[PDB]
Protein backbone atom coordinates (compact mmCIF):
# COMPACT_ATOMS: atom_id res chain seq x y z
CA UNK A 1 0.00 0.00 0.00
CA UNK A 2 1.54 3.22 -1.32
CA UNK A 3 -0.91 6.04 -0.33
CA UNK A 4 -1.60 9.30 -1.67
CA UNK A 5 -3.91 12.46 -1.25
CA UNK A 6 -5.52 14.26 -4.22
CA UNK A 7 -5.35 17.89 -3.97
CA UNK A 8 -8.04 20.20 -6.06
CA UNK A 9 -9.04 16.78 -6.78
CA UNK A 10 -11.87 17.95 -9.36
CA UNK A 11 -14.22 14.45 -10.04
CA UNK A 12 -10.81 12.31 -9.93
CA UNK A 13 -9.18 12.48 -13.37
CA UNK A 14 -5.74 11.82 -11.79
CA UNK A 15 -6.98 10.09 -8.62
CA UNK A 16 -8.01 7.34 -11.77
CA UNK A 17 -4.49 7.60 -12.93
CA UNK A 18 -2.86 7.18 -9.57
CA UNK A 19 -5.37 3.81 -8.56
CA UNK A 20 -4.80 2.00 -11.97
CA UNK A 21 -1.29 2.45 -11.19
CA UNK A 22 -1.16 1.14 -8.00
CA UNK A 23 -1.89 3.91 -5.33
CA UNK A 24 -4.75 3.76 -2.55
CA UNK A 25 -6.25 6.86 -2.84
CA UNK A 26 -6.92 7.88 0.86
CA UNK A 27 -8.43 11.30 0.76
CA UNK A 28 -9.99 13.65 -2.07
CA UNK A 29 -9.73 17.57 -1.08
CA UNK A 30 -12.12 19.36 -3.72
CA UNK A 31 -13.87 22.51 -3.14
CA UNK A 32 -16.78 22.51 -5.68
CA UNK A 33 -19.95 20.37 -3.97
CA UNK A 34 -20.74 18.78 -7.55
CA UNK A 35 -17.11 17.71 -8.62
CA UNK A 36 -16.45 16.62 -5.05
CA UNK A 37 -19.86 14.57 -4.99
CA UNK A 38 -18.80 12.71 -8.66
CA UNK A 39 -15.64 12.15 -6.65
CA UNK A 40 -16.77 10.27 -3.92
CA UNK A 41 -19.65 8.68 -6.34
CA UNK A 42 -16.50 7.16 -8.55
CA UNK A 43 -14.35 6.86 -5.44
CA UNK A 44 -16.66 5.71 -2.38
CA UNK A 45 -13.72 4.52 -0.54
CA UNK A 46 -11.75 7.57 -0.34
CA UNK A 47 -12.00 10.13 2.04
CA UNK A 48 -13.95 13.25 0.79
CA UNK A 49 -12.91 16.98 2.24
CA UNK A 50 -14.80 19.25 0.98
CA UNK A 51 -12.74 22.14 1.80
CA UNK A 52 -10.46 25.09 1.00
CA UNK A 53 -6.41 23.95 1.00
CA UNK A 54 -5.69 27.39 2.57
CA UNK A 55 -7.72 25.76 5.86
CA UNK A 56 -5.45 22.92 6.02
CA UNK A 57 -2.29 21.95 7.56
CA UNK A 58 -0.43 18.84 8.35
CA UNK A 59 -1.95 18.38 11.90
CA UNK A 60 -5.33 19.06 10.72
CA UNK A 61 -5.16 16.37 7.96
CA UNK A 62 -3.24 13.93 10.14
CA UNK A 63 -6.29 14.84 12.67
CA UNK A 64 -8.73 13.53 9.58
CA UNK A 65 -7.00 10.75 9.42
CA UNK A 66 -7.14 10.07 13.02
CA UNK A 67 -4.60 6.96 12.40
CA UNK A 68 -0.90 7.69 11.75
CA UNK A 69 -1.52 7.39 7.96
CA UNK A 70 1.99 7.64 6.07
CA UNK A 71 1.01 9.96 2.91
CA UNK A 72 3.34 8.62 0.41
CA UNK A 73 2.72 10.83 -2.10
CA UNK A 74 0.48 14.51 -2.40
CA UNK A 75 -0.98 14.69 -6.27
CA UNK A 76 -2.88 17.34 -7.56
CA UNK A 77 -3.76 20.66 -9.34
CA UNK A 78 -2.63 23.63 -7.89
CA UNK A 79 -4.67 26.56 -9.49
CA UNK A 80 -2.75 29.19 -10.91
CA UNK A 81 -4.33 32.68 -12.17
CA UNK A 82 -2.54 32.46 -15.69
CA UNK A 83 -3.50 33.46 -19.03
CA UNK A 84 -6.12 35.43 -16.79
CA UNK A 85 -7.44 36.25 -9.97
CA UNK A 86 -5.24 36.47 -6.85
CA UNK A 87 -6.54 33.85 -4.53
CA UNK A 88 -5.44 31.22 -7.25
CA UNK A 89 -2.37 32.01 -6.70
CA UNK A 90 -1.90 31.51 -3.06
CA UNK A 91 -3.78 28.29 -3.06
CA UNK A 92 -0.79 27.76 -5.72
CA UNK A 93 1.66 28.23 -2.45
CA UNK A 94 -0.70 26.47 -0.24
CA UNK A 95 -0.08 22.92 -2.34
CA UNK A 96 3.63 23.54 -1.89
CA UNK A 97 2.80 24.33 1.76
CA UNK A 98 0.90 20.98 2.31
CA UNK A 99 4.12 19.17 0.49
CA UNK A 100 6.74 20.60 2.81
CA UNK A 101 4.61 20.65 6.15
CA UNK A 102 3.82 16.66 5.31
CA UNK A 103 7.01 15.44 3.97
CA UNK A 104 5.31 12.40 1.51
CA UNK A 105 8.08 10.52 -0.71
CA UNK A 106 7.13 12.28 -3.81
CA UNK A 107 4.67 14.92 -5.11
CA UNK A 108 3.04 15.33 -8.74
CA UNK A 109 1.18 18.77 -9.58
CA UNK A 110 -0.40 19.31 -12.57
CA UNK A 111 -0.61 22.27 -14.34
CA UNK A 112 -2.22 24.21 -17.86
CA UNK A 113 0.14 26.04 -19.98
CA UNK A 114 -0.18 29.75 -18.77
CA UNK A 115 2.04 28.33 -15.32
CA UNK A 116 5.44 29.55 -16.66
CA UNK A 117 5.29 33.14 -17.69
CA UNK A 118 7.37 35.48 -16.32
CA UNK A 119 4.76 37.00 -13.86
CA UNK A 120 4.48 33.84 -11.69
CA UNK A 121 8.28 32.99 -11.56
CA UNK A 122 8.21 34.57 -8.47
CA UNK A 123 6.18 32.35 -6.58
CA UNK A 124 6.82 29.17 -8.74
CA UNK A 125 10.80 30.27 -7.22
CA UNK A 126 8.93 30.91 -3.69
CA UNK A 127 7.25 27.11 -4.22
CA UNK A 128 10.91 25.73 -5.46
CA UNK A 129 12.20 26.93 -2.40
CA UNK A 130 9.45 25.27 -0.26
CA UNK A 131 10.46 21.96 -1.04
CA UNK A 132 14.11 21.77 -3.08
CA UNK A 133 15.89 21.20 0.92
CA UNK A 134 14.11 18.15 1.27
CA UNK A 135 13.23 16.85 -3.01
CA UNK A 136 14.54 16.15 -5.95
CA UNK A 137 12.95 18.10 -8.34
CA UNK A 138 12.88 17.12 -11.27
CA UNK A 139 12.63 19.22 -14.49
CA UNK A 140 8.82 20.29 -16.17
CA UNK A 141 7.47 17.49 -18.27
CA UNK A 142 5.07 18.63 -20.71
CA UNK A 143 3.45 16.12 -22.46
CA UNK A 144 0.60 15.73 -25.44
CA UNK A 145 -2.32 13.39 -24.38
CA UNK A 146 -1.89 11.94 -27.55
CA UNK A 147 1.39 10.64 -27.65
CA UNK A 148 0.00 8.17 -24.59
CA UNK A 149 -3.06 6.77 -26.38
CA UNK A 150 -5.78 9.30 -25.95
CA UNK A 151 -7.18 10.68 -27.86
CA UNK A 152 -6.94 14.17 -27.36
CA UNK A 153 -4.50 16.48 -28.36
CA UNK A 154 -3.87 18.49 -25.04
CA UNK A 155 -1.41 19.59 -23.27
CA UNK A 156 -0.07 19.59 -19.86
CA UNK A 157 2.98 20.20 -17.41
CA UNK A 158 3.53 17.91 -14.51
CA UNK A 159 5.49 18.82 -11.51
CA UNK A 160 7.46 16.07 -9.81
CA UNK A 161 9.64 16.16 -6.90
CA UNK A 162 11.34 12.99 -4.85
CA UNK A 163 11.94 13.00 -1.49
CA UNK A 164 16.08 13.15 -1.05
CA UNK A 165 16.37 10.87 1.74
CA UNK A 166 15.09 7.97 -0.97
CA UNK A 167 18.33 8.54 -3.08
CA UNK A 168 16.71 7.68 -6.17
CA UNK A 169 17.82 8.38 -9.78
CA UNK A 170 14.96 9.11 -12.36
CA UNK A 171 16.20 8.55 -16.06
CA UNK A 172 12.98 10.33 -18.73
CA UNK A 173 12.43 6.31 -19.99
CA UNK A 174 10.22 5.89 -17.20
CA UNK A 175 7.40 8.64 -17.92
CA UNK A 176 8.14 8.13 -21.97
CA UNK A 177 5.36 6.32 -23.96
CA UNK A 178 6.87 3.20 -25.17
CA UNK A 179 4.34 0.82 -27.18
CA UNK A 180 1.24 3.00 -27.65
CA UNK A 181 -0.98 3.10 -30.39
CA UNK A 182 -2.86 5.87 -31.12
CA UNK A 183 -6.84 6.32 -30.71
CA UNK A 184 -8.36 8.35 -32.98
CA UNK A 185 -11.80 10.01 -32.92
CA UNK A 186 -13.51 7.23 -35.02
CA UNK A 187 -11.76 4.66 -32.61
CA UNK A 188 -12.79 6.52 -29.54
CA UNK A 189 -16.72 7.09 -30.45
CA UNK A 190 -16.90 3.20 -31.85
CA UNK A 191 -20.04 1.18 -30.88
CA UNK A 192 -21.94 3.89 -29.28
CA UNK A 193 -25.78 4.53 -30.05
CA UNK A 194 -26.38 6.34 -33.49
CA UNK A 195 -29.87 8.25 -32.45
CA UNK A 196 -29.79 9.70 -29.05
CA UNK A 197 -32.07 11.73 -26.12
CA UNK A 198 -31.71 15.16 -27.97
CA UNK A 199 -32.89 17.33 -24.61
CA UNK A 200 -32.34 20.96 -23.13
CA UNK A 201 -31.14 19.88 -19.52
CA UNK A 202 -32.89 17.16 -18.66
CA UNK A 203 -32.58 15.64 -15.08
CA UNK A 204 -32.64 11.81 -15.90
CA UNK A 205 -29.57 9.65 -16.65
CA UNK A 206 -29.45 8.88 -20.25
CA UNK A 207 -28.62 4.84 -20.24
CA UNK A 208 -27.51 3.47 -23.35
CA UNK A 209 -26.66 0.25 -24.97
CA UNK A 210 -23.78 0.15 -26.30
CA UNK A 211 -21.27 -2.28 -28.71
CA UNK A 212 -18.43 -3.97 -27.07
CA UNK A 213 -16.89 -6.24 -29.16
CA UNK A 214 -13.69 -4.68 -29.35
CA UNK A 215 -10.28 -5.44 -28.62
CA UNK A 216 -6.96 -3.61 -27.85
CA UNK A 217 -5.14 -1.20 -25.08
CA UNK A 218 -8.19 1.07 -25.36
CA UNK A 219 -10.85 -0.82 -24.93
CA UNK A 220 -9.35 -2.76 -22.12
CA UNK A 221 -9.10 0.45 -20.63
CA UNK A 222 -12.60 1.89 -21.60
CA UNK A 223 -14.70 -1.18 -19.94
CA UNK A 224 -11.93 -2.12 -17.51
CA UNK A 225 -9.16 -1.81 -15.36
CA UNK A 226 -10.87 -0.98 -12.14
CA UNK A 227 -8.75 -0.70 -9.16
CA UNK A 228 -9.63 -2.29 -5.95
CA UNK A 229 -12.25 -0.73 -4.19
CA UNK A 230 -13.06 1.98 -6.99
CA UNK A 231 -16.33 2.33 -8.78
CA UNK A 232 -20.04 2.95 -9.02
CA UNK A 233 -21.99 -0.19 -8.49
CA UNK A 234 -24.48 0.51 -10.61
CA UNK A 235 -22.26 1.56 -13.37
CA UNK A 236 -20.29 -1.25 -13.04
CA UNK A 237 -23.31 -3.68 -13.66
CA UNK A 238 -24.83 -1.61 -15.90
CA UNK A 239 -21.89 -2.36 -18.17
CA UNK A 240 -21.54 -6.14 -17.50
CA UNK A 241 -25.16 -5.36 -19.58
CA UNK A 242 -23.18 -3.47 -22.42
CA UNK A 243 -25.27 -0.20 -21.27
CA UNK A 244 -23.78 3.16 -20.22
CA UNK A 245 -24.33 6.62 -18.97
CA UNK A 246 -24.16 10.10 -20.50
CA UNK A 247 -26.08 9.46 -24.01
CA UNK A 248 -27.72 12.55 -23.77
CA UNK A 249 -28.08 15.12 -26.83
CA UNK A 250 -28.70 18.61 -27.25
CA UNK A 251 -31.88 19.66 -29.50
CA UNK A 252 -30.72 21.72 -32.18
CA UNK A 253 -32.36 23.84 -34.40
CA UNK A 254 -32.93 22.70 -37.88
CA UNK A 255 -30.91 25.52 -39.18
CA UNK A 256 -28.35 25.11 -36.35
CA UNK A 257 -28.07 21.18 -37.05
CA UNK A 258 -27.96 21.98 -41.55
CA UNK A 259 -25.13 24.13 -40.66
CA UNK A 260 -23.62 21.76 -38.73
CA UNK A 261 -24.36 18.87 -41.36
CA UNK A 262 -22.07 21.19 -43.96
CA UNK A 263 -19.09 21.47 -41.50
CA UNK A 264 -16.37 19.07 -43.42
CA UNK A 265 -13.84 17.56 -40.74
CA UNK A 266 -11.83 19.89 -38.81
CA UNK A 267 -14.02 22.69 -39.72
CA UNK A 268 -14.95 25.27 -37.15
CA UNK A 269 -18.59 26.48 -37.98
CA UNK A 270 -18.39 30.86 -38.52
CA UNK A 271 -21.35 31.46 -36.37
CA UNK A 272 -20.87 28.96 -32.94
CA UNK A 273 -17.22 28.17 -33.10
CA UNK A 274 -17.79 24.77 -32.47
CA UNK A 275 -15.48 22.57 -34.50
CA UNK A 276 -16.17 19.19 -36.41
CA UNK A 277 -14.16 16.71 -35.38
CA UNK A 278 -11.92 14.84 -37.91
CA UNK A 279 -12.30 10.89 -37.38
CA UNK A 280 -9.03 10.28 -38.16
CA UNK A 281 -7.84 13.79 -36.08
CA UNK A 282 -7.84 13.75 -32.13
CA UNK A 283 -10.39 15.85 -30.00
CA UNK A 284 -8.29 19.46 -29.81
CA UNK A 285 -8.59 21.30 -26.14
CA UNK A 286 -11.75 20.38 -24.65
CA UNK A 287 -17.77 25.65 -26.76
CA UNK A 288 -18.56 21.35 -28.07
CA UNK A 289 -17.31 19.70 -30.34
CA UNK A 290 -19.26 19.02 -33.62
CA UNK A 291 -19.97 14.65 -34.05
CA UNK A 292 -17.99 13.87 -36.83
CA UNK A 293 -21.11 12.11 -38.74
CA UNK A 294 -23.95 13.15 -37.06
CA UNK A 295 -24.96 17.14 -37.00
CA UNK A 296 -24.93 17.56 -33.43
CA UNK A 297 -22.35 18.77 -30.74
CA UNK A 298 -20.85 15.81 -29.10
CA UNK A 299 -22.09 13.91 -25.44
CA UNK A 300 -20.73 14.14 -22.42
CA UNK A 301 -20.01 10.54 -23.05
CA UNK A 302 -18.53 11.22 -26.17
CA UNK A 303 -16.20 13.77 -24.73
CA UNK A 304 -15.79 11.29 -21.62
CA UNK A 305 -14.33 9.04 -23.95
CA UNK A 306 -11.72 11.69 -25.79
CA UNK A 307 -10.71 12.65 -22.64
CA UNK A 308 -9.74 9.19 -22.10
CA UNK A 309 -12.59 8.45 -18.94
CA UNK A 310 -13.72 5.02 -18.97
CA UNK A 311 -17.26 3.76 -19.90
CA UNK A 312 -18.11 2.99 -15.95
CA UNK A 313 -16.68 6.52 -14.35
CA UNK A 314 -20.17 8.49 -13.43
CA UNK A 315 -20.21 11.84 -14.00
CA UNK A 316 -23.09 14.47 -13.07
CA UNK A 317 -26.35 14.06 -14.73
CA UNK A 318 -26.20 17.05 -16.34
CA UNK A 319 -25.02 17.98 -19.39
CA UNK A 320 -23.70 21.62 -18.12
CA UNK A 321 -21.87 19.88 -14.95
CA UNK A 322 -20.63 16.81 -16.71
CA UNK A 323 -19.09 18.89 -19.53
CA UNK A 324 -17.23 21.28 -16.90
CA UNK A 325 -16.25 17.96 -15.01
CA UNK A 326 -14.51 16.17 -18.22
CA UNK A 327 -13.02 19.60 -19.55
CA UNK A 328 -11.52 20.15 -15.82
CA UNK A 329 -10.00 16.80 -16.02
CA UNK A 330 -6.46 15.13 -16.59
CA UNK A 331 -6.83 12.66 -18.72
CA UNK A 332 -7.07 9.23 -17.10
CA UNK A 333 -4.40 7.82 -19.51
CA UNK A 334 -1.88 10.32 -19.09
CA UNK A 335 -2.43 10.20 -15.51
CA UNK A 336 -1.96 6.61 -15.17
CA UNK A 337 1.25 6.52 -17.31
CA UNK A 338 2.96 9.02 -15.56
CA UNK A 339 2.22 7.67 -12.27
CA UNK A 340 3.02 4.04 -13.04
CA UNK A 341 6.71 5.30 -13.39
CA UNK A 342 6.33 6.89 -9.61
CA UNK A 343 4.87 3.63 -8.30
CA UNK A 344 7.54 1.26 -10.16
CA UNK A 345 10.32 3.79 -8.65
CA UNK A 346 9.05 3.49 -4.99
CA UNK A 347 8.86 -0.42 -5.21
CA UNK A 348 12.83 -0.70 -6.17
CL1 LIG B 1 -4.26 15.47 -19.79
Redesign the pocket.
Known sequence: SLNVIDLFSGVG?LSLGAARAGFDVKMAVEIDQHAINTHAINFPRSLHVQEDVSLLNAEIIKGFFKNDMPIDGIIGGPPCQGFSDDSRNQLYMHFYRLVSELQPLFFLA?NVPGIMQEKYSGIRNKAFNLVSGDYDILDPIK?K?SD?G?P?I???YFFIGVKKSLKLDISDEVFMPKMIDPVTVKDALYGLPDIIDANWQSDSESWRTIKKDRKGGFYEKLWGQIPRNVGDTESIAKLKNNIISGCTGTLHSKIVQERYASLSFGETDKISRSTRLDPNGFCPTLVRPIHPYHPRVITPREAARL??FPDWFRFHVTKWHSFRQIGN???P???EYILKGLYNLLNE
Open positions: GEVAYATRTRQGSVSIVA
